[PDB]
Amino acid sequence: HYEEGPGKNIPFSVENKWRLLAMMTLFFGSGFAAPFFIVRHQLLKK
Amino acid sequence: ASAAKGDHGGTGARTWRFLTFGLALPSVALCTLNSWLHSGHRERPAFIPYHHLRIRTKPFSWGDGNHTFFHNPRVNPLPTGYEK
Amino acid sequence: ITAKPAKTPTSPKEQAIGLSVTFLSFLLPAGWVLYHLDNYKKS
Amino acid sequence: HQTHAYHMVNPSPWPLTGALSALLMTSGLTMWFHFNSMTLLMIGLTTNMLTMYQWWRDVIRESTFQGHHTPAVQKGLRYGMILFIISEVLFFTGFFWAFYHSSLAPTPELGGCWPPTGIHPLNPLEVPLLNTSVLLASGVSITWAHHSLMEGDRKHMLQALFITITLGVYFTLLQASEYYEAPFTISDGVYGSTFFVATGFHGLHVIIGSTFLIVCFFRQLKFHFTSNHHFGFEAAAWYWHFVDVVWLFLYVSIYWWGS
Amino acid sequence: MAYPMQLGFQDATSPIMEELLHFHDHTLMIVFLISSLVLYIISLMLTTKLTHTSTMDAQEVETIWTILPAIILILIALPSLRILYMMDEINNPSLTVKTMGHQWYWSYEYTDYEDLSFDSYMIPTSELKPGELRLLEVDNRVVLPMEMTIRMLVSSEDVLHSWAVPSLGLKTDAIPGRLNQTTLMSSRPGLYYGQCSEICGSNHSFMPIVLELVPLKYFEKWSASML
Amino acid sequence: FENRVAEKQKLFQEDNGLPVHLKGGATDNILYRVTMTLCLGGTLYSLYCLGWASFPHK
Amino acid sequence: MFINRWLFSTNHKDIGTLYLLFGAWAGMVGTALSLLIRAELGQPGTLLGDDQIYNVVVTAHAFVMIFFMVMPIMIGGFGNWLVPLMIGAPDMAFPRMNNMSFWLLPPSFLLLLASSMVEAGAGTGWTVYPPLAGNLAHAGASVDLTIFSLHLAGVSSILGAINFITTIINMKPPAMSQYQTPLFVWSVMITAVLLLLSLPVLAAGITMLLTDRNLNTTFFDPAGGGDPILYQHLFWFFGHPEVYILILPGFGMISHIVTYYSGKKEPFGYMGMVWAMMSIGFLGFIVWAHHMFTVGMDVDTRAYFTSATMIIAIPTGVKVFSWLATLHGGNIKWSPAMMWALGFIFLFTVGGLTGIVLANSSLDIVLHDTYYVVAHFHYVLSMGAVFAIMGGFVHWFPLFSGYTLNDTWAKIHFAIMFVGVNMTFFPQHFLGLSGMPRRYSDYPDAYTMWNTISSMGSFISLTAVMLMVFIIWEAFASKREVLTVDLTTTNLEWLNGCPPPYHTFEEPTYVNLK
Amino acid sequence: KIKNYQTAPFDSRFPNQNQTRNCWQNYLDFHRCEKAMTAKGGDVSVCEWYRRVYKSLCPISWVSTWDDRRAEGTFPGKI
Amino acid sequence: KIKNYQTAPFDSRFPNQNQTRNCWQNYLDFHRCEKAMTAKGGDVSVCEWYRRVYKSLCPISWVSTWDDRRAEGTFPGKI
C-alpha cells in the first residue's frame, strides 16, 4: 500500500520547507518563464 | 408499416434466422445480381481543366505529390489532364 | 476550521525569505528577456 | 475490503502508453505532412495498437477471469458505451452539416449548381444500393446472433456472428473498389471533400466495428460469454447498429439526395 | 475618430448611429441599475447580526425574479430589433462602391459608370505630415457624396478582413468569395475613420479606412477628374 | 474447442500480488517493456524532432 | 511505488491532484502570455514585433487559459476530488480511463508549445478561422500542431465527460435520487453533457481545416465551392457551449461556498438552481451565431439569435438572486473563500450584463471585434471562472492537503487580485465603445490613456499570482494540521478527515428509503 | 432607352446582406443575352441593363476571372 | 441559323415520355424573348426557335388557353 496523511498524498516532498521552496520555485517559475523564452526564440530566428 | 409479411407471435433466434436467410441474404443476392449487370466501364468524359476541381494547394504527402491516394489512371485526370 | 499548531512554524524572517525567493523566481528570468529585447530584435 | 459492488482497478500503465501513442500519432502526422517522413507516425500507430490490445485484454481478464463485472459495473459500462456512441453521432453531425451547407447553397465556382459542373456522381442504384442491403442484412444477422446467445445456442451464435462479419467485410471491399473506380477524387472541390471525408470516416468506423465483432467472435469461440452476461457483444452490436444507421443517412443524403 | 480619454461612442455621423447611441443609453441605464442593485443587496445581506437559517420557501420570490427580468429583456429587445430592422430597410441607393480587403490595405472600385479603382494604404508614421494621425491616415481616401444613400459592397481577395467605420455605425466582414452589402449615409461632410476589424495577419493593426464626405457637386467633380 | 475458462479463472485469481496487466506471466512483461520502450523512445525522438523543426534548416 | 502511484494511478483523488498541479502550472504560462500582451499595449508603438508574434501570444494565452488552466482545474481537479466524495462513491466509474484523460493533457500542451516554436507560430486567434489559418496564409506546421493539440484536449474531455456522467448517474447510494445530490455534482454532470455534445463538432470542424491544409479538400475554400463561414458555424457551435462549460463548475462551487460560509445547511432554492443550470446548458446550444453578427447573415436570423441569447439571462438571474438569498439571514463567516465568492457574484453579474449588451445584433455591429467584447469575457472569466477557482482552492485546500492556509495572507491576496483585475479590464469598456479593435499590437494615439492603465492593472494581478505561490508554500512549510471542520452534516466530502484516506467509502454510506 | 441609370436598384430576389448571387445572376444574364443576340438576327444593346447591373455590383477581379475562364472553356456556369 | 427546321429536336432536359414541361418551357421562353425584344426595340425574329418548338409540341387548346390568360392578366407563369 501507499503512504497516507498530510504531506504523503502528493507527488512532491514537504519534508524540508527549503527543499520545497526550491521545487516550487523551479515548478511555477519554469511555467512563467517559458513564454518569455519562446518569444525570445521567435525574435532571434529571423 | 408499409411493407407486409406478418409474424411477431413471439420473437426469438429462430425468427431472426428465418429473416436472415429468407429476406436479408436474398436481398443482398438480388442487389449483387443487379450490380453485376450494370457494371462495365462507362466512356470517360472529355477533360476540361475546371478550376474548382483537381485542387492542389499543397502537394500530397506521398508519390509525386500530384496523385490522389486511390488515383485510377483510367478515370482520374491530373490537373493537366489524363495520363498517357 | 480548527488546526493543530504548526509542526514546523515559519517565522517572519523565514516568510520574508520564501516570499523574496518566490517573487525573484518569476521576476528575474522574464526581466532578463525583457531587458535584452533590443539585442534580439536586431538579429 | 469493500462492501460496495464497484471495481477498484489495478494501477495500470496503459493510460500513459495510450496518451503517449496519441502524442506520437499526431506529431507523426505532422512529420508526414511537413517533413516528408513516416517514422514517428508508424511508431505511434504501433504503440496505439499495443495499448488497445493490452487494455481490452485486461478488461477481459478483470471480467471473464476475475469476476469484477457485477451488475452495477455492467450498468456503468452500458452508460459509458451509449455516451460514447452519442459523441460519435455528433462527430458525424459536423460532416453532414458541412455537406448540407455546401450542397444547399452551391457557390458560383461550382457553376452555382449541385452537383457541381464537371462532377459525375456514382449511380446510387448500383453499388451504393448493394452496400445498403449488405449493412441492413448484417443488422438482421447480428440480431439473430444476439438471440442465439441469449438462448444458449453456441453453434448458431457463431454462424450468425460470422455472417455479420462477412457482410461487414463485403461492405468494406465494395467501398474500396468504389473508391478506386470513382471518377472524382477528394481534391474535386467541396463535392469530393464531403463525399470522401464523410464516407471515409464512416468506412473507418465499419472497420472498427468489424474488428470489434471479430474480437467478440474469438471470445465466443473461447466460451467467454454466458447466455446472460456478454456486454462486449452487446456493445459491439450497438456500435454496429450505429454504423448501419450512419450509412443510411449517408446514403439518403450524399448518394441519393446529393446526386 | 476617437479622441483622448474618450469614454463612450464616437459622435454619431449617420442617423442609424444616432439610433444606436440612444439605444445604448437606454440599455446602459438598465445595466447600471441591475449591477448596482446586486452590489447593494450583497451589502444589505452582509450588514446585519439578525439571522434566519432554517429552510426558506422559494416559490413566491422566484416568480418575481423570473417575471421581472423577462419584462426587462423585452424592454431591451423591442428597441434593439426595431433598429435591426430599420438598418435592413430598402433605401434605393444612388451610388454603389465596392471595397476589397487585402493583406494589408483596402482597394476601392467605383464602377457604376466609369471603371475607377484604386488602392488605399496606411501612411507610415515616418511619412505623416505634421498634425496627421498616427496609424489612421491613408494615401487615397474613399471620396463619397454626403447626405446620400450609398451601397457599400465588401469582399476580400485573400484572408478575412472586416470593413468598419464606427462613427457611421458600420462593420461588415470582408470574406473571399462573398459580396456583403451595407448602406452608408453621412449627415455631414468631413473625414471619418475606421480600422480593419478581423484578424488578418502581420499588419492587421495597420490597414485603416478613411472616408471623405463632400457635397455631391464636389464628388461629381472628383469622379470626372479620374477620367 | 473446449471450455477452458475455469483454468484461466484460476490463473488470474492466483494470489501472487501481480497487477492484472502482468498476471498472464512472462509474456506480459515482454509486451509491456516493448510497449513502454517504444512510447518513451518515440517520445524522446519526438522531442528531438521538435528541436530540429524549431530552427531554420538551410 | 512512485511511478505506480503517480503515472499508473487509478485513484480519483490522486488524479485530481495531478490535474490541479497541471492547471496551476498552465496558469503560470497563461499569466506570462497575458503580461506579454499587456506589455506590448502598455505604451503606444511596437515592443515585440508586428501582429504575427503578437497574435501568436494572444492565441496561446487563450488556449492555455481555457484548455490547460480552467477546464483541468475545475473538471479534472475539483471534479475528480470532490464528485466521488460528495456522492459516497469509492472512485469514478472508469478509474483507469480517468488517468488517460489526465495524461493526454501534457502531450496536448507539448503540441501547443511546439506550434509556437516552429516557423512563425499560429497567429490565428484561438478561433483559428480560415483562410488566415489555412496553408497559404499560415503555411507550415504551426496551425497543424495547434489542431492536433485541440484534438488531444478534446479526446481527454470527451472521455472525462463520459466518466463523470456515468459516475454521477450510476454510483450514488441506492436511496439517493438525483434531486438529493449536491449542486456541485449537478454542475459537473451538466458541464459533462455539454462537452460530450459540443467537442465532437469542434473536432469535425478542425479536422476539415486539417484536410483543407494537407489533403486538398476545400470545405472552407471558395475556389472549390467551400465557405469560410461554415468553419465559423462549426467552431461556435462548440465555442458558445464551451463558455458555459467554463463557468458551470464555477457556479456549482460558488453555491457550495456561499452556503457554507453563510452557516446554512442548504442553498436557497435548490430545485431552482438545478433548473437554472439545465436551462443554461440547453439554451447554450441554440445561440452560437451571436459570434457572427457582422459576417452578413439574414436579418431574421440575426433577430432570432439576439432574442435567444438574451433568454439565458433569466435562469442566470435566478442563480444570482438565489446566492443572495442564501446569504440572507446567514451567520456570515468572512473567510477568504467567502470574499472570492462575493466578488464572483458582483463581477460575474457585470460581465453577464455586458454580454446582454452584446447580444443585441444592432449594437454589436459597432462593438464586435472591439475591446468591449474583451471586457465582457474577462469579467466573466478573469473575475468569474478564476474567482470561483480561487474560492474553491482556498476553501478545499485543507481537505486536499490536510493543512490550513494563513487566512490573513489569503485575504491580502484576494484584495490585490480584486484591484488588479478591475484596473486591467474596466477601462477596456471605454476602449471598446470608442472603437479600439481586438487583436491589435498597437493603437491610434487617442487610445493611450486606457491602454496604459489596463497594462498597469495587469502587473498588479501578477503580484497577486506571485503572492499566491508564496501562500501555498507557507502552508506546506508550516504544517498546521487540520483537526475539525464545521457543517460536516451537510458537506459529506469533509467527513473522512483531511486529507481523506487513499480509499474512501470502501464500506459505502447507509441511506434508507422509508 | 428606359435608361437614366445611376446604380443597380433593389432586387427583391436578393434582399439580404449577401449579394454574391445578384452579381453572378446578372453576369450570367448579360452573357446569356449577349450570346443569343449574336447567334441570331439581333443586337447586343438589348442586353444592356444586365451589363450595367453586373458591372456596378461585381468585383473587377470576379469579372476578370470569369471572363478568362469563359475564354479558356472552363467557366462552370451555363451560358 | 438552323433553318430547314423540320420538327422539334430531342432535348436532353426532357428525355421522358411526359413532354408537358417541354411544351411549357418553350412557350415561356418564346414569350419571355418576345417581351424582352419588343421592349428594347429589337427584333422578335431572334425568338423564332422557341416559337417553332412550342408550336410543334403544344396542343392548340393549351396555347390558346395560355394566350387568353396572358391577355386577361391571369397567366400564372412568369413572363
Ligand SMILES: CCCCCCCCCCCCCCCCCC(=O)OCC(COC(=O)CCCCCCCCCCCCCCCCC)OC(=O)CCCCCCCCCCCCCCCCC
Ligand atoms: C464595475 C467593476 C468595478 C469597477 C471599479 C473601477 C471603476 C470605478 C467604478 C465605476 C463607477 C460606476 C459607474 C460607471 C462609471 C463609468 C463612467 C461613465 O461615465 O460611463 C460613460 C459610458 C459612456 O458615457 C458617455 O457617453 C460619456 C458622457 C459623460 C462624460 C462626462 C465626462 C466626465 C465624467 C467623469 C467620469 C470618469 C470615469 C473614469 C473611470 C476610470 C476607471 C479606472 O461608458 C460606459 O458605458 C462604461 C461602462 C461599461 C458597463 C459596465 C457598468 C458596470 C458597473 C456599474 C456598477 C458600479 C458600482 C460601483 C463600483 C463598486 C466597486 C466594488
Ligand code: HEA
Ligand atoms: C465564462 C465565460 C462566458 C460566459 C458565462 C458568457 C456569458 C454570456 N455571454 Fe459571452 N463570451 C465569452 C465568454 C462568456 N460569455 C467569450 C470567451 C467570448 C468571446 C469569444 C471570442 O470572440 O474570442 C464571448 C463573446 C460573447 C458575444 C459575442 C460578442 C462579439 O464577438 O461581438 C456575445 C454576444 O451576444 C456574448 C453574450 C453573452 C451573454 C448574453 C452571456 C450570458 O450567459 C450572461 C447572462 C448573465 C447575466 C444577464 C447576469 C446575471 C443576471 C441577473 C442579475 C438578472 C437580471 C438581468 C437582466 C434582466 C439582463 N458573449
Ligand code: HEA
Ligand atoms: C479563462 C480565460 C482567460 C483568463 C483567465 C484570462 C486572463 C487575462 N487575460 Fe485574456 N483572453 C482570453 C481568456 C482569458 N484571459 C481569451 C479567450 C482571449 C481572446 C484570444 C483571441 O483573441 O483569440 C483573451 C484575450 C485577451 C486580451 C486581448 C488581446 C487582443 O485582442 O489583442 C488581453 C489584453 O489585455 C487579455 C489580457 C488578460 C489578462 C491581463 C489576464 C489576467 O487577468 C490573468 C491574471 C492571472 C490570473 C487570472 C491567474 C492565473 C491563474 C492561475 C495561476 C491558477 C492558479 C491555480 C490554482 C489556484 C490551483 N486577454
Ligand SMILES: CCCCC/C=C\C/C=C\C/C=C\C/C=C\CCCC(=O)O[C@H](COC(=O)CCCCCCCCCCCCCCCCC)COP(=O)(O)OCCN
Ligand atoms: C471503406 C473504404 C474506405 C476506408 C477508410 C479509408 C481511410 C479513412 C481513414 C480515416 C478518414 C479520416 C481522414 C479522412 C481523410 C480523408 C480520407 C477519406 C477516405 C479516403 O480514403 O479518401 C481517399 C483520399 O485519401 C487521402 O487523401 C489520404 C488518407 C490518408 C491520410 C489521412 C490523414 C488524416 C488523419 C486525420 C485524423 C483526424 C482524427 C480526429 C479524431 C478526433 C476525435 C475527437 C479518396 O481517394 P481519392 O484518390 O482522392 O479519390 C478516389 C479516385 N479514384
Ligand SMILES: CCCCC/C=C/C/C=C/CCCCCCCC(=O)O[C@H](COC(=O)CCCCCCCCCCCCCCC)COP(=O)(O)OCC[N+](C)(C)C
Ligand atoms: C431584476 C430583478 C430584481 C428582483 C429583486 C427581488 C427582491 C425580492 C424580495 C422579496 C422577498 C419577499 C419574501 C417574503 C417571504 C416571507 C415569509 C416569512 O415571513 O417567513 C416565515 C416562513 O418563512 C419561509 O419559509 C421563508 C422565509 C423568508 C424567506 C423568503 C424568501 C427570502 C428572500 C430573500 C431575498 C434576498 C434578496 C434577493 C435578491 C433580490 C413565516 O413567518 P410568520 O412571522 O408569519 O410566522 C413565523 C413566526 N411565528 C413563530 C411567530 C409564527
Ligand SMILES: CCCCCC/C=C/CCCCCCCCCC(=O)O[C@H](COC(=O)CCCCCCCCCCCCCCC)COP(=O)(O)OC[C@@H](O)CO
Ligand atoms: C420504408 C421506405 C423505404 C424506401 C423505399 C424507396 C422509396 C422512395 C420514395 C421516394 C419519394 C421521393 C422521390 C422524390 C424525387 C423526385 C421525384 C418526383 O418529383 O416525381 C413526381 C412524383 O413524385 C413523388 O415523389 C411522389 C412521392 C410519394 C411516393 C410514395 C411512393 C411509395 C409509398 C410507400 C408508403 C409506405 C408507408 C410509409 C409509412 C410507414 C412525378 O414527376 P416527374 O417524375 O418529375 O416527371 C416529370 C418528367 O417525366 C418530365 O419532365
Ligand SMILES: CCCCCC/C=C/CCCCCCCCCC(=O)O[C@H](COC(=O)CCCCCCCCCCCCCCC)COP(=O)(O)OC[C@@H](O)CO
Ligand atoms: C485493420 C485493423 C485496424 C484496427 C484498428 C483498431 C481499431 C479497432 C478497435 C476495435 C474495438 C475493439 C474493442 C474490444 C473490447 C474488448 C473488451 C470487452 O468487450 O470487455 C467487455 C466489457 O466491455 C467493454 O469494456 C466495452 C469496451 C468498449 C470498446 C469500444 C471501442 C470503440 C473504439 C473506437 C475507437 C476509435 C473511434 C474513432 C475516431 C475517429 C468485457 O465484459 P463482458 O463482455 O461482459 O465479459 C464478461 C463475461 O465474460 C462474464 O461472464
Ligand SMILES: CCCCCC/C=C\CCCCCCCCCC(=O)O[C@H](COC(=O)CCCCCCCCCCCCCCC)COP(=O)(O)OC[C@@H](O)CO
Ligand atoms: C488525430 C488523432 C487524435 C486522437 C488520437 C487518439 C487519442 C487517444 C489514444 C487512445 C487509445 C485508446 C486505448 C484504449 C482505451 C480503452 C478505454 C475503455 O475501454 O474504457 C472503458 C470505459 O469507457 C467505456 O466503456 C466507453 C468508451 C470507450 C472509449 C474507447 C477509446 C476511444 C478513444 C478515441 C475516442 C475519440 C472520440 C470520438 C468522437 C469524436 C473501461 O474503463 P476502465 O477505466 O479502463 O475500466 C473499468 C473496469 O471496471 C473495466 O473492467
Ligand SMILES: CCCCCCCCCCO[C@@H]1O[C@H](CO)[C@@H](O[C@H]2O[C@H](CO)[C@@H](O)[C@H](O)[C@H]2O)[C@H](O)[C@H]1O
Ligand atoms: C525556460 C523554459 C522554456 C521552455 C520553452 C522552450 C524555450 C526554448 C527556447 C530556446 O531558445 C533558444 O535559445 C538559444 C540560447 O542558446 C538561442 O541561441 C542563440 O544564443 C546562443 C547562446 O548565447 C548563441 O550561441 C546562438 O548562436 C544564438 O542563435 C536561440 O536563438 C533560441 O531559439
Ligand SMILES: CCCCCCCCCCO[C@@H]1O[C@H](CO)[C@@H](O[C@H]2O[C@H](CO)[C@@H](O)[C@H](O)[C@H]2O)[C@H](O)[C@H]1O
Ligand atoms: C512582465 C513580468 C516581468 C516584470 C519585470 C520584472 C522586473 C525586473 C526584475 C529583475 O530583472 C533583472 O533586471 C536586471 C536589471 O535591473 C537585469 O540585469 C541586466 O542589466 C544590469 C544593469 O544594467 C546588468 O548588470 C546585467 O548584467 C544585465 O543582464 C537582469 O538580467 C534581470 O534579471
Ligand SMILES: CCCCCCCCCCO[C@@H]1O[C@H](CO)[C@@H](O[C@H]2O[C@H](CO)[C@@H](O)[C@H](O)[C@H]2O)[C@H](O)[C@H]1O
Ligand atoms: C526506440 C523507440 C523508437 C525510437 C525510434 C527512433 C527513430 C530514429 C530514426 C532516425 O532516422 C532518421 O529518419 C528520418 C525520417 O524519420 C530520415 O529522414 C529521411 O526521411 C525521408 C522519408 O523516407 C526522406 O524524404 C529524407 O530524404 C530523409 O531526410 C533521416 O535520414 C534519419 O536520420
Ligand SMILES: C[C@H](CCC(=O)O)[C@H]1CC[C@H]2[C@@H]3[C@H](O)C[C@@H]4C[C@H](O)CC[C@]4(C)[C@H]3C[C@H](O)[C@]12C
Ligand atoms: C417543477 C420543478 C421542480 C419542483 C420539485 O419537484 O421540487 C420546479 C423547480 C424550479 C421551478 C421553476 C423556477 O422556479 C423558475 C420559474 C419560476 C416561475 O415562478 C414559474 C416557472 C419556473 C420556470 C419554475 C417552474 C417550476 O416550478 C420548477 C421547474
Ligand SMILES: C[C@H](CCC(=O)O)[C@H]1CC[C@H]2[C@@H]3[C@H](O)C[C@@H]4C[C@H](O)CC[C@]4(C)[C@H]3C[C@H](O)[C@]12C
Ligand atoms: C469449431 C466450432 C464448433 C463449436 C465448438 O467449438 O464446440 C464451429 C461451430 C460453428 C462454426 C463456424 C460457423 O459455422 C460459421 C463459419 C462457417 C464457414 O464454413 C466458415 C467457418 C465458420 C467460422 C465456422 C467455423 C467452425 O466450424 C465453427 C466455429
Ligand code: CUA
Ligand atoms: Cu485586414 Cu485585419
Ligand SMILES: [Cu+2]
Ligand atoms: Cu457565445
Ligand SMILES: [Mg+2]
Ligand atoms: Mg469578427
